[PDB]
Design an enzyme around this catalytic site. Structure first.
Site, mmCIF file in Angstrom:
data_model
loop_
_atom_site.group_PDB
_atom_site.id
_atom_site.type_symbol
_atom_site.label_atom_id
_atom_site.label_comp_id
_atom_site.label_asym_id
_atom_site.label_seq_id
_atom_site.Cartn_x
_atom_site.Cartn_y
_atom_site.Cartn_z
ATOM 1 N N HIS A 249 0.858 -1.211 0.000
ATOM 2 C CA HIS A 249 0.000 0.000 0.000
ATOM 3 C C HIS A 249 0.884 1.247 0.000
ATOM 4 O O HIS A 249 0.495 2.261 -0.567
ATOM 5 C CB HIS A 249 -0.967 -0.009 1.180
ATOM 6 N N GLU A 250 2.047 1.178 0.635
ATOM 7 C CA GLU A 250 2.955 2.351 0.796
ATOM 8 C C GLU A 250 3.930 2.455 -0.371
ATOM 9 O O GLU A 250 4.224 3.539 -0.797
ATOM 10 C CB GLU A 250 3.684 2.242 2.116
#
Lengths: 1335, 681
Positions: A249-250
């Protein structure tokens, strides 16, 4: 190639001497470096400092550290938990029974095992490989080059980490020996952050406002050993957030930091309004909630129960506003954008002769091209639109679909207190086998992972109180609990266009069709990954903080509202569980009196809750409870059916409402129907107040004004510039106005009504938790008889088993009503006011253009040629725009994308689905011998090659399964969705398995088995659930996972060489079977024994005839009979089929039969006139019995010759005209010829087809798309043109009937009386001579 | 109720407002029962009748046990005192026994709701036809006929649904309450729904045609074989040459409307709640100027602009994309709006708001005047449609089986097409590599030799999706290399070692275009794999991952547009310039003398393209002629077009001086303006 990891350990020695000549800097892998961080102090003041950190280059551009940089105190005490676990001991001291070095050795070996998992997912998917490339191997360029960095220098603070050695004079690591290429840095969460907080940050943020396109390496503060719990889409089935998705996600956040498109910023420095979404709760003081659109694009999850999402046209609007920027009327709030920042960066090299490695460094950075002549960068305003668009090519939702791992945003975490959030994830398999490198976490059920033990656990909350009342509502502090604010109306004004005004050129309006394929990443091995340039930077403390994604808001706002908001109505409708019930729940029908007791449950005033407030009559025993609870279940289904009303605002359309929506305005469900007469569009809003004031539907659109012309020079060239520019900004104002109108509809109306759709599905789920606990409290009534409680508690648990389907039916209806409302407000209010305003804009701008053009010509400020040029220009340009049609096609592509989401909706989904809802696409991908493979990658196919084949066949391809007359019950095809992970087991699991089956007649009753579904009941465990077999001379769908396990005899003969479609809707209690589209029956009155998951095997067995299969499918929830009929008609496509269910073919020998008698044509004794004769039946044995079935091999055969002959295997479609040629005599074709010497004056004959013949062109009736059969239509034309009505008898179409003395023809009636009665169509059948059918 | 109470006269506007409420009263359905049956599609007005009599609706008093009370059913089924030799034989006996004992007591309350339905519709026929005289009225009575006929079948279908779950319940109770067949296969005594329902009533509300047929335009011949022209079944007028042409989009014929050629029919919307329209297919050649006059609205297609005039209202011009080949158009007339749809790609084209009230119920004519060069009509249907019938949900294409180019002309065996990729458009040119063994998509602008494509089948000329082709590849000179496959690479082979390719119609997610995937018989699909910055390979991958097999199409996701190819024509390159007579001092831009250009594929491009170079300028100060060469540099050929710009000498002055007239001094021009001279002076 991609995540090729270096031999680096935690025990590997740091670089202490370089020597600069013998050894390369690309071979240094552990070294001390410096990463820019947002440090804090004792004051709490932020400052952007550099920190020393030992690095470990684990792969070709990716660095990790294990240090936990001292970035100031957390401010939260040790072992506390707001929603993330705050500690100061993790990777600084001894934390949780392990030393600092053991925590530091684990974090190295932990992160390096996470990237081992990503490398195993690099080769199994092209879509993850293209990500890790685009994010590791990318060239990274940052614009405002700092002090100490020369121009034409490929490594600086944006894309490199310094290599530091230690001074001889002191122990400080700052002797810079060069800097190697950086893309990713993975550090632990710092001192000022909690243990579980993953946050991505640009590696280098310079002083001043970040420019769009200014790339950087990205730093991630991520710990893979901790996670937080989440309440999944599967209701009250709590799970753990997968940390291998939390890093992805990052990195998705970080790919934006490498491209520069992650902090859009205006000239004044703040985030523009088009880059966030704002929530609002108004009261004593205002509470707001900002969710930036970069967060909405990183978790672009398209479900109803997820607020963190945007549509594909709103995404493209944000992608296009990052690319071209966005000028405002206040120029300090304009956005520079990527194109106007790359172009202002590459024009510094316009006369400077850069090197070759620097030129290729930029040409792969921004896709630009550099010419050797003219010394400049030719910048292309399509490869930069392709640069920003390819920055958002993937997101956490698409990672969670490839990697079958379940997720939910941190921005929608509701504290339903099942206990503690923070858990210990064991990624090194120290206690049990938790996380492989091939597959990820082997569970997400939080009974695996050890829960953390905090001392104080305070969830942050929005505390809402009503003004004159006393009951605190602690809502979750998330985006769901706020009113989604309208976007500010634009109000386009005048421009005052001169000859020198630099109006925008690269403005695109709404784009309808775009290939959004992210172009493949080419590698360049011939580029340096380091530089031996000791150049001191400016590492002075910049006062400020860095833009960190995914920061979790941990405050608590107290707002004293005036009006009860829907989020609060949702809250007080919940039983307020946490207790053990001593007294009955005090159900209260009034909303404004529920907020006076802090113990009442607000029930709506429906005839489901008024039968719940008044209990069952206890005088009647078990029977009175069954009628009471049974009537409540029926009265709750009445709240779930959408019913249409009428509004004076919406002409020509009936808007939709669900009876339940009365709960949010405290009406009696019949006073609620009263309020839609004399109504407005500010009804249909269950959530119409922010807490303080009325907040109606923002259907108002800004007025668009015509531009002015002001010539500052009086030359003929200055007016040709001005008269050209006025048309150029006319098209620019329309392209911005129709784009502002899509975003006003897609936010203020579609997103508002979709959010009120999901506030309704929440509230209906909350009031169903009040029905459950009151019917459960009434079931433990001591006044009942004790052997009546056995019947009563079994009834409470039976009404409860229908909540699943009720809440699906409610969600499918609440979504369909609010989507059609948002569709109808567009078509009737918004798009009408756009068309009404742009019609006055087209007309007034043309009137203004053609009164300054005739003024300039008569005065003489323009030439005669230029006056004729701009008069033809006004006739062709100042016309009704096609952007109001592009606004229509945009808003009706979002609705279709959500009409398709509602059709495939399931309450509980596991596998990544289709757009049809299917999770399986078996294909026969083989060179010579076909191996079956799932094309969605959800299933694993075992296909025994000795028997399982794959042919061309039914729709495209079949799976032939061969005989086995020797060994029964041998699985030869097994399509499993069982990985071997631990899934959420439930008894409340519905699904729908479905497959086409063509089987010839089986003569033998061998009591074998055909097919068995087996759902996952554990970890590498599966319980058989649905077994199709031969049981007693009949096909029986037995059942093996019910508490009583009934069978279901398939009475309709399914094995008669015809393609049947077997659909089995397995709900919890009911198991409905469908043959084709008609419900064969149910297995009811028993529930599921063993809890299962939505994964399982599709074991198809050997049978004693060669059967086939096609479209084997699995749906995550129930399918309606309405949707089974729609799926069945659309599966057939646009083809006309045989009787056997195979598509018709030209030049194929077809027995033409009548479908009612199955009677076939025959020539009269010697002549060529036809007589329909009956075809005798077949005495078969079907499963050992003596069935008598329809015969098909009788009478005359007919090819369907096309109009100019091609070859045989071409298929017949709806609307394909042909010519039925006799086969027994090849020179004769069917025609309809008038004789006037027989009783039937217009007989159907066989006429000669030699040379220029007038054989009848036939067709099938396109307007009756039957399956398995079709109505013949004599078109009335021949290959020589239309047939003479003297020769034929009539002139137009003729249906072909089974009636002599009509001449087997009747006129197709197309008058205004043909639909006053039922049409009575005459169906015909085409049977080809098949080898699996003997008579 | 509140509509029919607060009314002293029914307006023509309130006719539509009422018929939507009767359609929402008598055709509205409550959907779910979920116990004592799953598909229980009960109409809304009947449960309101049961609510007003018994307090609760019919679901809340089947649960109470009042099903046999309120239907006056006073009997249950019984087995005979001697069961047959096979208990399968009492399967239809219980269907006859339940029909007599129990269904005709349900069927006698269907009789009462059929009488209440007819007495209510009789009342609104009385309250409207006596309070409204108007041309819309026959549309209201025709639509009340349709709601009555449909509600009478919905009432019929609901008692079969009540009947089926009562028959299902009585057959379980007839053998559970007997020791003779206490345990028995009850599913051998029950029926499926579609054998139970079609035994009782062959037709239901699904068998009703909601609208009358679509009135196909057709040539025909009389009994005297005179060339008449039908529109459905009735002969219509014809004014010029309407003949047949083999030039069709499929292997059918097509109608040739010659210049200034017209037919004229009649049409009328039977119902008030309907949109009426014209569905027709035509070949969009250049200079088409036809005009359909439908329901007192003239829709004039002219030079790729749409003009829609209501009778007695303002003409509004509408700008569309250039329609390139065979187009399917629908001219929808709605209430208060006229909408033109493309039916190839299923998108809206024009939406014109009707400023006058549109009456589709009276008979109005249907013209098509051609006015310019020969319109090749294929189809022409005048239909009447539901008012909320969407053209969005239909999957796009001709739905024909023929493979079309991007400009919607069918592909002929031969004819030298151009493969384009969907990732990289027209700007991505198919070529051979340096070794002359691979076809390669090169997105360079310095591509040396383009490679065109010839498909061939030894079958019918319009190439079907259902037929496998061989793909020859011919360059600028004429070297013909067949495409084959080895090591999962598209290479050049001889003729005898060529491979059958199967073009299949496909679509990708966020586009409206129709693409083609190229597969082999082994499901090996041509992927465009990138190998360099500007060079793309053509490598076969087994199947398309995450691709959905729809009707016969593939729905590719946005990530699998490698496999999506499309086809363009060649040699359509054009460049048209003009000769502008300027004056001394009058300005000149390069776009002044440029009329229109066009790519190798037919794409209308302008002077701002990077392929049109303007070599030469002017002075506009000296009198001499100036020749400017416009040049389009293609992929293989460069065509130059000469454009001369004369600068004619202008000496234009109207020198004046001031004058004072005398006592009522008669005025002429000559006393003031003194020096007036023309261009040549």
């Amino acid at each position: 190639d991609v995540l090729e990891m270096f031999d680096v350990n935690y025990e590997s020695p740091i670089l202490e001497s370089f020597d600069s000549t013998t050894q390369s800097l690309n071979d240094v892998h552990v070294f001390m470096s410096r990463i820019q961080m947002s440090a804090y102090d004792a004051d709490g003041e932020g400052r952007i400092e550099y920190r020393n950190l030992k690095l470990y280059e684990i792969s070709s551009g990716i660095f990790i550290s294990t240090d936990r940089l001292d970035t100031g105190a957390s401010g939260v005490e040790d072992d506390h938990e707001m929603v993330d676990y705050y500690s100061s001991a993790r990777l600084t001291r001894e934390f949780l029974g392990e030393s600092l070095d053991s925590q530091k050795s684990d974090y190295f070996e932990g992160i390096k095992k996470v990237f081992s998992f990503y490398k195993n997912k690099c080769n199994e998917s092209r879509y993850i490989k293209e990500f890790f490339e685009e994010i590791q191997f990318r060239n990274i360029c940052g614009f405002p080059k700092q002090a100490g960095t020369s121009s034409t220098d490929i490594f600086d603070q944006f894309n490199s980490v310094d290599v530091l050695l230690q001074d001889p004079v002191t122990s400080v690591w700052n002797k810079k020996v060069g800097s190697k290429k950086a893309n990713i840095v993975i550090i632990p969460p710092a001192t000022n952050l909690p243990i579980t907080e993953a946050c991505a940050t640009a590696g280098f943020q310079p002083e001043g406002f970040p420019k769009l396109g200014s790339g950087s390496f990205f730093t991630v503060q991520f710990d893979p050993f901790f996670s937080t719990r989440f309440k999944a889409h599967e209701t009250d089935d709590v799970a753990l957030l997968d940390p291998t998705l939390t890093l992805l996600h990052e990195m998705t956040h970080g790919l934006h930091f490498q491209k520069g498109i992650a902090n859009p910023v205006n000239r004044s420095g703040e985030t523009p309004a088009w880059a966030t979404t704002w929530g609002r709760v108004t009261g004593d003081n205002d509470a707001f909630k900002e969710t930036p659109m970069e967060e909405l694009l990183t978790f672009n999850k398209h479900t109803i129960d997820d607020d963190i999402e945007i549509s594909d046209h709103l995404k493209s609007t944000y992608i296009g506003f990052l690319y071209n920027g966005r000028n405002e009327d206040d120029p300090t709030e304009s956005v520079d954008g990527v194109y106007q920042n790359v172009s202002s960066f590459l024009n510094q090299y316009r006369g400077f002769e850069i090197s070759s490695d620097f030129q290729h460094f930029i040409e792969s950075c921004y896709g630009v091209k550099y010419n050797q002549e003219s010394k400049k960068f030719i910048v292309n305003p399509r490869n930069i639109k392709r640069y920003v668009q390819d920055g958002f090519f993937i997101d956490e939702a698409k990672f969670a679909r490839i990697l079958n791992i379940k997720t939910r945003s941190y921005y929608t975490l509701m504290p339903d207190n099942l206990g503690v959030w923070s858990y210990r994830v064991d990624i090194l398999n120290r206690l049990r086998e938790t996380f492989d490198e091939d597959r990820g976490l082997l569970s997400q059920e939080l009974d695996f992972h050890t829960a953390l033990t905090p001392v104080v656990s305070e969830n942050p909350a929005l505390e809402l109180e009503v003004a004159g009342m006393q009951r605190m509502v602690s809502l979750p502090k998330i985006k769901a609990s706020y009113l989604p604010s309208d976007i500010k109306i634009k109000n386009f004004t005048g421009q005052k266009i001169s000859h020198d005004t630099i109006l925008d050129t690269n403005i695109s309006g709404i784009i309808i069709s775009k290939i959004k394929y992210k172009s493949d990443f080419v590698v360049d091995e011939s580029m340096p990954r380091s530089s031996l340039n000791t150049t001191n930077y400016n590492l002075s403390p910049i006062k400020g903080t860095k833009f960190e994604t995914d920061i979790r808001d941990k405050t608590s706002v107290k707002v004293t509202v005036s009006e009860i908001t829907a989020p609060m109505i949702n809250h007080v409708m919940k039983l307020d569980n946490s207790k053990v019930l001593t007294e009955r729940p005090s159900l209260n029908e009034d909303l404004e009196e529920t907020f006076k007791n802090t113990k009442d449950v607000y029930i709506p005033k429906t005839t489901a809750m008024m039968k719940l407030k008044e209990g069952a009559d206890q005088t009647l025993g078990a029977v009175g409870f069954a009628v009471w609870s049974g009537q409540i279940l029926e009265d709750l289904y009445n709240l779930a059916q959408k019913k249409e009303v009428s509004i004076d605002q919406i002409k020509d359309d009936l808007m939709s409402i669900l009876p339940f929506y009365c709960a949010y305005k405290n009406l009696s469900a019949e006073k609620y129907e009263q309020a839609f007469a004399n109504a407005t569009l500010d009804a249909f809003l269950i959530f119409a107040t922010d807490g303080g004031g009325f907040a109606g539907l923002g259907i108002t659109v800004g007025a668009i004004a015509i531009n002015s012309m002001y010539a500052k020079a009086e030359t003929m060239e200055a007016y040709d510039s001005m008269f050209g520019k006025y048309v150029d900004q006319y098209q620019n104002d329309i392209k911005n106005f129709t784009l502002n109108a899509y975003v006003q509809w897609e936010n203020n109306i579609l997103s508002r009504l979709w959010n009120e759709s999901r506030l309704a599905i929440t509230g209906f789920r909350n009031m169903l938790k009040t029905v459950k606990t009151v019917m459960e409290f009434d079931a433990t009534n001591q006044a009942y008889s004790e052997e009546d409680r056995k019947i009563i508690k079994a009834k409470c648990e039976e009404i409860f088993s229908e909540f699943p389907m009720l809440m699906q039916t409610f969600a499918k209806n609440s979504m369909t009503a609010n989507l059609e409302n948002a569709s109808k407000i567009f078509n009737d209010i918004v798009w009408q006011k756009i068309k009404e305003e742009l019609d006055q804009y087209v007309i007034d701008s043309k009137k203004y253009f053609l009164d300054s053009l005739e003024e300039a010509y008569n005065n003489g400020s323009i030439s005669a040629e230029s006056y004729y040029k701009y008069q033809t220009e006004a006739r062709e340009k100042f016309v009704s725009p096609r952007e109001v049609i592009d606004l229509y096609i945009a808003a009706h592509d979002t609705v279709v994308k959500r009409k398709r989401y509602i059709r495939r909706y399931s309450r509980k989904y596991d596998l990544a689905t289709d757009f049809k809802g299917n999770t399986v696409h078996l294909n026969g991908l083989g060179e010579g011998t076909q191996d079956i493979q799932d094309l969605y990658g959800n299933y694993s196919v075992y296909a025994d090659k000795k028997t399982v084949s794959t042919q061309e066949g039914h729709f495209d391809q079949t799976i032939k399964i061969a005989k086995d007359t020797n060994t029964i019950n041998k699985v030869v095809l097994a399509v499993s969705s069982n990985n071997g992970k631990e899934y959420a087991l439930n008894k409340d699991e519905q699904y729908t398995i479905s497959f086409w089956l063509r089987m010839p007649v089986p003569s033998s009753s061998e009591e074998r088995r055909i097919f068995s579904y087996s759902a996952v009941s554990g970890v590498n465990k599966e319980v058989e659930e649905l077994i199709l077999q031969v049981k007693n001379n009949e096909f029986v769908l037995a059942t093996a996972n019910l508490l009583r396990n009934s069978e279901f005899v398939i009475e309709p003969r399914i094995a008669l060489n015809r393609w049947v479609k077997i659909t089995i809707v397995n709900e919890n209690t009911r198991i409905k079977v469908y043959q084709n589209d008609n419900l064969l029956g149910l297995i009811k009155d028993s529930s599921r024994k063993k809890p299962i998951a939505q994964r399982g095997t599709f074991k198809f067995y050997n049978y004693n005839v060669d059967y086939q299969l096609d479209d084997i499918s699995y749906y995550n929830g129930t399918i309606s009979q309405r949707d089974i009929k729609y799926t069945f008609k659309e599966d057939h496509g646009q083809f006309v089929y045989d009787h056997w269910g195979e598509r018709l073919q030209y030049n194929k020998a077809y027995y033409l039969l009548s479908d009612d008698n199955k009677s076939a044509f025959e020539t009269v004794y010697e002549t060529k006139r036809l007589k329909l004769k009956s075809v005798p039946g077949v005495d078969i044995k079907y499963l050992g019995m003596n069935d008598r079935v329809y015969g098909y091999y009788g009478g005359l055969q007919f090819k369907l010759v096309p109009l100019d002959s091609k070859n045989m295997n071409n298929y017949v479609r709806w609307g394909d005209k042909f010519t039925m040629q006799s086969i027994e005599t090849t020179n004769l074709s069917l025609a309809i010829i008038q004789d006037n010497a027989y009783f039937a004056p217009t007989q159907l004959k066989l006429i000669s087809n030699e040379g220029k013949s007038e054989e009848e062109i036939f067709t099938f009736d396109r307007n009756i798309k039957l399956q398995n059969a079709a109505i013949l239509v004599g078109t009335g034309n021949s290959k020589q043109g239309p047939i003479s009505a003297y020769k034929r008898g009539y002139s137009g179409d003729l249906w072909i009937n089974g009636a002599r003395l009509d001449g087997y023809v009747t006129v197709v009636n197309k008058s205004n009386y043909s639909n006053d009665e039922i049409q009575e169509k005459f169906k015909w059948i085409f049977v080809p001579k098949d080898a699996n059918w003997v008579e | 109720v509140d509509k029919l109470s607060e009314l002293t006269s029914v307006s023509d506007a309130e006719l539509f407002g009422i018929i939507r409420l009767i359609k929402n009263e008598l055709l509205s359905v409550i959907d779910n029962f979920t116990t004592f049956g799953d598909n229980w599609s009960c109409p809304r007005w009947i449960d309101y009748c049961f609510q007003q009599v018994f307090g609760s609706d019919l679901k809340n008093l089947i649960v109470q046990g009042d099903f046999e009370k309120v239907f006056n059913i006073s009997d249950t089924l019984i087995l005979p005192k001697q069961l047959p030799e096979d208990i399968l034989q009492l399967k239809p006996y219980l269907f006859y026994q339940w029909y007599a004992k129990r269904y005709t007591r349900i069927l006698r309350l269907e009789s009462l709701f059929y009488q209440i339905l007819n007495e209510h519709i009789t009342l609104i026929r009385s309250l409207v036809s006596s309070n409204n005289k108007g041309q819309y009225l026959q549309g209201f009575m025709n639509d009340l006929d349709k709601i009555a006929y449909n509600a009478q079948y919905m009432l019929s279908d609901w008692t079969i649904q009540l009947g089926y779950y009562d028959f299902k319940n009585q057959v379980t109770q007839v053998i559970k309450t007997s020791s003779m067949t206490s345990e028995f296969n009850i599913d051998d005594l029950l029926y499926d729904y579609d054998t139970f329902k079609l035994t009782i009533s062959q037709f239901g509300a699904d068998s009703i045609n909601n609208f009358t047929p679509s009135q196909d335009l057709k040539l025909a011949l009389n009994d005297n074989n005179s060339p008449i022209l039908l529109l459905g079944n009735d002969e219509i007028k014809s004014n010029g040459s309407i003949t047949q042409t083999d030039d069709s989009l499929d292997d059918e014929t097509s109608l040739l409307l010659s210049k200034n050629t017209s037919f004229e029919g009649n049409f009328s919307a039977k119902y008030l709640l309907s949109s009426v329209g014209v569905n027709f297919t035509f070949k969009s050649i250049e200079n088409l100027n036809f005009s359909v006059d439908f329901m007192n609205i003239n829709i004039a297609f002219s030079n790729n602009f749409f003009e829609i005039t209501q009778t007695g209202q303002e003409t509004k011009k509408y700008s569309i994309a250039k329609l390139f080949g065979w187009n399917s158009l629908v001219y929808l007339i709605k209430h208060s709006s006229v909408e033109i749809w493309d039916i190839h790609s299923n998108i809206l084209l024009v939406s014109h708001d009707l400023t006058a009230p549109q009456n589709n119920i009276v008979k109005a004519p249907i013209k098509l005047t051609n006015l310019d060069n020969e319109l090749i009509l294929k189809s022409f249907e005048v239909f009447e449609q539901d008012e909320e019938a969407n053209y969005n949900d239909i999957e796009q294409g001709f739905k024909n089986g023929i493979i079309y180019t991007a400009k919607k002309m069918p592909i002929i065996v031969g004819e030298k097409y151009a493969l384009k990729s969907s990732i990289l458009d027209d700007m991505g040119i198919l070529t051979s590599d340096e070794n002359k063994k691979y076809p390669v998509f090169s997105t360079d602008v310095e591509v040396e030799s383009s490679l065109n494509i010839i498909l061939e089948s030894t079958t019918g000329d319009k190439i079907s999706v259902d037929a496998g082709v061989n793909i020859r590849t011919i360059n600028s000179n004429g070297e013909e290399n067949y495409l084959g496959i080895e090591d999962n690479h598209l290479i050049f082979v001889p003729k005898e070692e060529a491979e059958l390719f199967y073009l299949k119609k496909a679509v990708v997610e966020d586009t409206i275009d129709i693409f083609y995937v190229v597969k082999t018989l082994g499901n090996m699909f041509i992927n465009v794999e990138r190998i360099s910055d500007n060079i793309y390979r053509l490598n076969f991958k087994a199947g398309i991952l995450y691709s959905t097999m729809e009707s016969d199409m593939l729905v590719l996701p946005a990530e699998e547009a490698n496999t999506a190819f499309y086809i363009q024509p060649i040699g359509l390159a054009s460049l048209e310039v003009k000769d502008s007579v300027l004056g001394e001092g009058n300005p000149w831009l390069k776009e002044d003398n440029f009329l229109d250009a066009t790519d190798d594929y037919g794409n209308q491009i302008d002077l701002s393209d990077n392929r049109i170079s303007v070599t030469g300028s002017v002075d506009t100060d000296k009198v001499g002629t100036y020749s400017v060469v416009y040049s389009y540099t293609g992929i293989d050929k460069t065509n130059t077009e000469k454009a001369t710009i004369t600068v004619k000498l202008d000496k234009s002055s109207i020198k004046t001086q001031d004058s004072t007239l005398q006592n009522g001094k008669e005025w002429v021009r000559a006393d003031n303006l003194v020096e007036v001279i023309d261009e040549d002076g």
